[PDB]
Amino acid sequence: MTEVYDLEITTNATDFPMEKKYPAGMSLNDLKKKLELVVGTTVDSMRIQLFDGDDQLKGELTDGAKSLKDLGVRDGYRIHAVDVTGGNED
């Protein structure tokens, strides 16, 4: 009934991958707000990159107007957040 997807979260600021399951029926804006809470970053300054379950990077999400399910984020995916305000990306 409720759709939930399991993720491995990475960030540029953190060097610790976090595995957690989240509701796919919710917006990206919530997911990233969850991330914003941990990293301390804000919405525009925090960029979300999606790595597929296979290996490759699919693209950038950035759309939280849809549901994570509609975005096809799915489970077993790795969500990489990057803080852009501090300039860190490498």
From Swiss-Prot:
Which residue positions does the secretion signal occupy?
A: none
Q: Where in the cell is it found?
A: Cytoplasm; Cytoplasm, Cytoskeleton
Described purpose of this protein according to its UniProt entry = Binds to alpha-tubulin folding intermediates after their interaction with cytosolic chaperonin in the pathway leading from newly synthesized tubulin to properly folded heterodimer.
Q: How does it assemble?
A: Supercomplex made of cofactors A to E. Cofactors A and D function by capturing and stabilizing tubulin in a quasi-native conformation. Cofactor E binds to the cofactor D-tubulin complex; interaction with cofactor C then causes the release of tubulin polypeptides that are committed to the native state.
Hey, which family's this protein in? Belongs to the TBCB family.
Protein name (Swiss-Prot/TrEMBL): Tubulin-specific chaperone B
Organism whose genome encodes this protein: Caenorhabditis elegans
Cite the source lineage. Answer: Eukaryota, Metazoa, Ecdysozoa, Nematoda, Chromadorea
Q: Which gene encodes it?
A: tbcb-1
**Included range, full protein:** 1 to 90 of 229
